[PDB]
Ligand binder design. Structure first.
Ligand code: CHL
Ligand code: CLA
Ligand code: CLA
Ligand code: CLA
Ligand code: CLA
Ligand code: CLA
Ligand code: CLA
Ligand code: CLA
Ligand code: CLA
Ligand SMILES: CC(/C=C/C=C(C)/C=C/[C@@]12O[C@]1(C)C[C@@H](O)CC2(C)C)=C\C=C\C=C(C)\C=C\C=C(C)\C=C\[C@@]12O[C@]1(C)C[C@@H](O)CC2(C)C
Lengths: 227, 67, 213, 227, 150, 40
């Protein structure tokens, strides 16, 4: 009885509202294999949660530091004063080691549900992990999981899906116009007709490559825009 | 007033090398194989004499068309 | 049931999926006869195994050339090795055919009469040359780690892995030859050019592969 | 061929009414050469292939008819840069007539991607005609769920090719198929018109229309024999 | 109008493709879709297609080649132009300006054909007779009018 | 394939291969040892 993505369209058999934010949308039928549907559901949570942090970071960073131009914020010379011109090789080493640990733990949970709940060092500590992708426990200090969990999952995925669309709008707008999200919004308001996608779509403002501390990094736009 | 139209038969014959290994298959006389050297000459002499292999005009015409 | 090279086409009768890497690909029915199929199964493995050694050797030496360690390109190594080391080519060629001839004749008469080379005739060795299957010698000489004598399920998995990397290597060795003829540069020299400008540097623009271009 | 709608067209004959019983879409009885006669049919001249081929020609022609004029109409309205306001036969398909420099790759590099992409699209479509339902069985990254067909080769249906499941009722589907065939047949004649008009006049389809409206008497096929 | 070994080479490749098509047709029309006896006995239909279709359109198609390829190329060859400097046959086809220089009648397009002013084409549809003095062979303009009439 | 190899075993096919081989051997010998008149 739930509303579907389009009017008068039959939902797939395997989509029966069990998961949150289920509109019965699967034109490519990628969820037919039950095991594949679980894996894709996790990746939807990862993209949804990472994307929401991405959108929040870009917007908040723009307000505090308007001139950083987040697209270029990755360059070492643009880093804050404490970290300015830090050796990117050492900086990457922290991320690889720390993310490899965290992500393998999450991966092992998917392979064998409930195996990696307990802390490895300090015996006794554990997380409830009521459902895969929702560890809870220490990950939910405020205890919002208690109550109408189903509704909260719906709110999370719906906002997360919107963030995914919104963030890729930031990327394409930066590539085409060369301005951040808020800056582009101001430009449209000033001259709604002269300054819009109909004009900017044909230009890609990203240089072909950059030199990061002597290492050349290729760059591209998402379409063959006029460099 | 028989109408002029395209008329064919589907898969009349099978594509196999079986008969390539049985010389004389086309003729009843030569199908039994050789006993004298006269058989060898008879094989080549009557190979394209379709009208004598079969009495069916349709079968004769189809061989002529593809030959 | 099992996947095939051309989806929707039933596999040939003589290919029942028992062999490793079987996708029912035999459009010319070259292996219809069961005894001839044994010969080609082993011919494919020998071709595949040599190609893997060839591809790995060509790739590794090419990396040595690009990095500047001084290795010559695969298409010049033969001339360089002989001249630099002062080797008589006809003697080296003859030695190869004695060693290959002895080793490869033994493989020939094991195919004809399986188990014949494990009779103790050759220096008293009676179990290292018995053979496990067609194209899979086994034993403690050809399989010192005993990966074919351990788990049966995983050994069948490796047979699938061996043939597919062998077929991939065979295609690669054809790529090395075709690329050298069209371009006249080393393997990784071509790879570097493609990564520079993939759009404007490939076979469609080399001026050879597509003459009408 | 009677224009417009009617029970039967000009070329309808008593011989063709023997097997043309209205079952097929757009069945107006027009078959003077009697190529659709079921009796003693074979090869490619059979009802199933000829009806299938017409729909395939209809759908390619519809894309071609709209795509061979849109650059001129959009360019005339200023919605695209003048650099891309190019006649359909001067895009690069016929380099002797004219070629466009500015694609992200050489037109032969683009063609190879076209070959590979169309090999998959066309050979998979063919295998459903030879073995109905066979493309929904072998693993294809989970996409085989949407390639199960519907028994009729020309109308696969399914979750993707019938994304919005229009024509749910039998009566509705027949009307849609009829509308598809008539638009498709009209586009096939339009494409032939583009080809003939290009040779006779050497100008784009849009230019020919504008010139005809200017001076209809002084601009038509008869006056274009000489210039 | 052949002037290079490339043109000879392409015809040979086309000849092999036709040879492959002919052998496929023989296999197809014997093992796959064999015409029935009633099909072979439409003598009226066969003559119609072989008179107007084989001989008729074959003669018209060859007239198209002579009018657009053979006549311009041989007109320049007889004038002494170096073969490598002659325009390619497709340049003659695409550029009506070039053809007008050799034969002014082309400046009027195909309007004379449809308006029945066939005398406009007298410059390349001739009735000279005799032999071309430079090459000792029949005029190709005469040969083109022959195949158009045929 | 059994029948096809049987066809290649027919007398005309064998003779063509055999004489093609025999002729090729003689032609190649005279290519590397031109003008042989005496054993020497
Ligand atoms: C009548 C003569 C005769 C002939 C024609 C052969 C022929 C053959 N025997 Mg042999 N045998 C013969 C008698 C005998 N064989 C054997 C026992 C065997 C066995 C057990 C085997 C053969 C095998 C073979 C084959 C080896 C193929 C090859 O490439 O070898 C290449 C040859 C060599 C590598 C050795 C010769 C190299 C070189 C000419 C001499 C070099 C000498 C120097 C000292 C080298 C020093 C180098 C160091 C210092 C680096 C070949 C068909 C083998 C085979 O293929 O079996 C299936 C095999 O396994 N024979 C005995 C003892 C009963 C014989 C008695 O008369
Ligand atoms: C996926 C998440 C993400 C990522 C990868 C980044 C990445 C970046 N942010 Mg952003 N940011 C994010 C989310 C993210 N942010 C969010 C959600 C917010 C809102 C709270 C912000 C608010 C923010 C600000 C206000 C600023 C950045 C800045 C930066 C830069 C790193 C500064 C540094 O050296 O920190 C060093 C970090 C640490 C030593 C670790 C801190 C860990 C605790 C938990 C915090 C870099 C471009 C800075 C920038 O643009 O510099 C030019 C900057 O000024 N971010
Ligand atoms: C079928 C669609 C189509 C195709 C195949 C092309 C192809 C091309 N366009 Mg054109 N273009 C189109 C439609 C299309 N365009 C439309 C509708 C517009 C108006 C928004 C433009 C505006 C435009 C500009 C301003 C420029 C090009 C240029 C180009 C070239 C590629 C480089 C580039 O920057 O493209 C960028 C173009 C796009 C990303 C348009 C994508 C259109 C998609 C494929 C169709 C669906 C669009 C959809 C209805 C949404 C429209 C906008 C929306 C706000 C309503 C290439 C020849 C460049 C050129 O001339 O180089 C010499 C160039 O500078 N196009
Ligand atoms: C059948 C495959 C094959 C073949 C025919 C060759 C052939 C060659 N290799 Mg290569 N090679 C191969 C596989 C192969 N390789 C593989 C699988 C690897 C490991 C990935 C290498 C790694 C390798 C290196 C590192 C070098 C060669 C070199 C050589 C040359 C001298 C070999 C020599 O003196 O050996 C004599 C060796 C022995 C008697 C012991 C065994 C020669 C052109 C040398 C070269 O090119 O020098 C200029 C060289 O330095 N090869
Ligand atoms: C002597 C020549 C000849 C004849 C009399 C026939 C006769 C027949 N063929 Mg066969 N065929 C031939 C040659 C011939 N074929 C060749 C050479 C090939 C290989 C290419 C085939 C391949 C073939 C197939 C695959 C099929 C037939 C079929 C048929 C039947 C219907 C034909 C029809 O209506 O065509 C009408 C023609 C068309 C619908 C196509 C017209 C356009 C074609 C593709 C090109 C014509 C080019 C033109 C002559 C020159 C253009 C000049 C310039 C503009 C470039 C009929 C029994 C069909 C059958 O069995 O039906 C029961 C069938 O399925 N033929
Ligand atoms: C059979 C159909 C067909 C074909 C073969 C062509 C072919 C062509 N068209 Mg035409 N066109 C057609 C139909 C067709 N058109 C139709 C129906 C219309 C009306 C809508 C148009 C409107 C049109 C315009 C307005 C223009 C062309 C142009 C072109 C040329 C350049 C094509 C190009 O750059 O594509 C670009 C390639 C793509 C759009 C495909 C992108 C493929 C990537 C991999 C997709 C990635 C997707 C991404 C990951 C996820 C989705 C993102 C999205 C939500 C934003 C080329 C000759 C251009 C031209 O003539 O330039 C000189 C041009 O300006 N066409
Ligand atoms: C590989 C494909 C193939 C296969 C397996 C078959 C199989 C068969 N065909 Mg079919 N056929 C094919 C292709 C094939 N055909 C083609 C391409 C055509 C078109 C020409 C035909 C036309 C055809 C006809 C008309 C007939 C068959 C018949 C047969 C049967 C016996 C054929 C036989 O004995 O051949 C063995 C014969 C040969 C090997 C001779 C080959 C002759 C070719 C044309 C080469 C000519 C070379 C020429 C002489 C060179 C000059 C010589 C000089 C230098 C000395 C058998 C079922 C017959 C049948 O079913 O009878 C009941 C039959 O009547 N076929
Ligand atoms: C069969 C023989 C033949 C052929 C093929 C041609 C062909 C041609 N002649 Mg020639 N001609 C011939 C006989 C022939 N002629 C004869 C016998 C005479 C003596 C009376 C002449 C006298 C003559 C003169 C005086 C002239 C020509 C000219 C021409 C050219 C333009 C004709 C024109 O305006 O067409 C108008 C339109 C058409 C023919 C219709 C074209 C239809 C197209 C091909 C449809 C394509 C549809 C398709 C779906 C679209 C592609 C889609 C795809 C890319 C996706 C053309 C190359 C003219 C020229 O330019 O000469 C250099 C010219 O001035 N001819
Ligand atoms: C009675 C017939 C006859 C004889 C005896 C010869 C003899 C010879 N001819 Mg003559 N010839 C003949 C007929 C004959 N010819 C005819 C009919 C023609 C016309 C087609 C020719 C045309 C002809 C030409 C054009 C040439 C000869 C040559 C030769 C010489 C070939 C030597 C050779 O190939 O060694 C090769 C060595 C061998 C050992 C061959 C046998 C190989 C097996 C495997 C040996 C096995 C051993 C155990 C030899 C003197 C050649 C020459 O130079 O003559 C002076 C030469 O060029 N002949
Ligand atoms: C993860 C993500 C973004 C993450 C961004 C991050 C971390 C950004 C970080 C930083 O920016 C900051 C904060 C500050 C900067 O200074 C530095 C960087 C480092 C740049 C986006 C995902 C974005 C993901 C997107 C847009 C995915 C869209 C998927 C769609 C539409 C799929 C549709 C369908 O598949 C279904 C569901 C079902 C099928 O049946 C049908 C089809 C149609 C195939």
């Amino acid at each position: 009885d739930r509303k579907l993505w389009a009017p008068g369209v039959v939902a797939p058999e395997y989509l029966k509202g069990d998961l949150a934010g289920d509109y019965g949308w699967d034109p490519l039928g990628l969820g037919a294999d039950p095991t594949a549907l679980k894996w894709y559901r996790q990746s939807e949570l990862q993209h949804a949660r990472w994307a929401m942090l991405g959108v929040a970071g870009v917007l908040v960073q723009e307000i505090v530091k308007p001139d950083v131009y987040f697209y270029e914020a990755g360059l070492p010379q643009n880093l804050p004063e404490p970290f300015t011109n830090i050796n990117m090789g050492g900086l990457l080493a922290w991320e690889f080691i720390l993310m490899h640990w965290v992500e393998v733990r999450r991966w092992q949970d998917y392979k064998n549900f409930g195996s990696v709940n307990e802390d490895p060092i300090f015996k006794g500590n554990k997380v409830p992990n009521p459902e895969m992708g929702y560890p809870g426990g220490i990950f939910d200090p405020f205890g919002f999981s208690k109550g109408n969990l189903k509704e909260l999952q719906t709110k999370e995925i719906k906002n997360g899906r919107l963030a995914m669309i919104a963030y890729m709008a930031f990327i394409l707008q930066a590539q085409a116009t060369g301005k951040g999200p808020l800056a582009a919004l101001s430009a449209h308001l000033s001259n709604p007709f002269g300054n819009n996608i109909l004009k900017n779509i044909g230009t890609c403002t990203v240089p072909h490559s950059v030199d990061v501390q002597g290492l050349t990094i290729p760059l591209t736009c998402l379409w063959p825009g006029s460099q | 007033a028989k109408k002029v139209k395209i008329a064919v038969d589907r898969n009349p014959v099978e594509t196999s090398f079986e008969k390539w290994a049985k010389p004389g298959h086309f003729s009843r006389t030569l199908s039994k194989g050789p006993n004298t050297t006269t058989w060898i000459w008879n094989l080549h002499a009557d190979a394209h004499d379709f009208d004598s292999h079969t009495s069916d005009l349709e079968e004769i015409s189809r061989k002529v068309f593809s030959a | 049931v099992r996947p095939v090279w051309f989806p929707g086409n039933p596999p040939p009768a003589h290919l029942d999926g028992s062999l490793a890497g079987d996708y029912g690909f035999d459009p010319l029915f070259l292996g219809q006869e069961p005894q001839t199929l044994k010969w080609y199964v082993q011919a494919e493995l020998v071709h595949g195994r040599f190609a893997m050694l060839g591809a790995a050797g060509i790739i590794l030496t090419s990396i040595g050339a690009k990095v500047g360690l001084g290795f010559p390109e695969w298409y010049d190594a033969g001339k360089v090795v002989v001249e630099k080391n002062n080797i008589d080519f006809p003697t080296l060629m003859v030695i190869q055919f004695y060693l290959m001839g002895w080793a490869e004749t033994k493989r020939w008469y094991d195919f004809k009469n399986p188990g014949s080379q494990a009779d103790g005739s050759f220096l008293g060795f009676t179990e290292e040359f018995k053979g496990l299957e067609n194209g899979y010698p086994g034993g403690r000489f050809f399989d010192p780690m005993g990966l074919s004598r351990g788990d049966a399920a995983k050994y069948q998995e490796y047979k699938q892995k061996e043939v597919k990397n062998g077929r991939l290597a065979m295609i690669a060795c054809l790529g090395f030859a075709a690329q050298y003829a069209a371009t006249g540069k080393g393997p990784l020299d071509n790879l570097a050019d493609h990564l520079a400008d993939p759009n404007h540097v490939n076979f469609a623009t080399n001026g050879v592969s597509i003459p009408i271009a | 061929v009677d224009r417009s709608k009617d029970q039967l067209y000009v070329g309808a004959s008593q011989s063709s009414l023997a097997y043309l019983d209205g079952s097929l879409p757009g069945d107006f009885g027009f078959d003077p050469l009697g190529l659709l006669d079921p009796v003693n049919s074979g090869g490619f001249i059979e009802p199933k292939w000829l009806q299938y081929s017409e729909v395939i020609h209809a759908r390619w022609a519809m894309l071609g008819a709209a795509g061979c004029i849109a650059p001129e109409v959009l360019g005339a309205a200023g919605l695209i840069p003048d650099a891309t306001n190019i006649k359909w036969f001067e895009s690069g398909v016929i380099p002797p007539a004219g070629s466009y420099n500015g694609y992200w790759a050489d037109p032969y590099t683009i063609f190879f991607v076209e070959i590979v992409a169309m090999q998959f699209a066309e050979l998979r479509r063919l295998q459903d005609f030879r073995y109905p339902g066979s493309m929904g069985q072998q693993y294809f990254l989970g996409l085989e769920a949407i390639f199960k067909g519907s028994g009729d080769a020309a109308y696969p249906g399914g979750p993707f090719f019938n994304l919005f499941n229009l024509g749910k009722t039998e009566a509705a589907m027949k009307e849609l198929k009829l509308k598809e065939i008539k638009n498709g047949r009209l586009a096939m004649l339009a494409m032939l018109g583009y080809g003939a008009q290009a040779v006779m006049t050497g100008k784009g389809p849009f230019q020919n229309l504008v010139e005809h409206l200017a001076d209809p008497v002084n601009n038509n096929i008869l006056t274009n024999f000489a210039g | 109008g052949i002037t290079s070994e490339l043109q000879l080479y392409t015809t040979a490749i086309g000849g092999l493709v036709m040879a492959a098509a002919m052998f496929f047709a023989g296999w197809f029309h014997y093992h796959k879709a064999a015409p029935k006896l009633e099909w072979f006995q439409n003598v009226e239909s066969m003559l119609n297609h072989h008179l107007g279709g084989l001989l008729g359109l074959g003669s018209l198609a060859w007239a198209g080649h002579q009018i657009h390829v053979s006549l311009p190329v041989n007109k320049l060859l007889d004038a002494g132009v170096d073969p490598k400097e002659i325009p390619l046959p497709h340049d003659l086809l695409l550029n009506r300006a070039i053809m007008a220089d050799l034969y002014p009648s082309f400046a009027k397009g195909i309007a004379p054909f449809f308006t029945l002013n066939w005398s406009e084409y007298s410059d390349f549809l001739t009735f000279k007779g005799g032999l071309n003095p430079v090459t000792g062979g029949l005029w190709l303009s005469d040969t083109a009018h022959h195949h158009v009439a045929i | 394939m059994k029948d096809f190899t049987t066809y290649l075993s027919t007398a005309p096919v064998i003779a063509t291969i055999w004489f093609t081989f025999t002729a090729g051997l003689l032609i190649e010998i005279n290519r590397y040892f031109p003008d042989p008149l005496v054993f020497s």
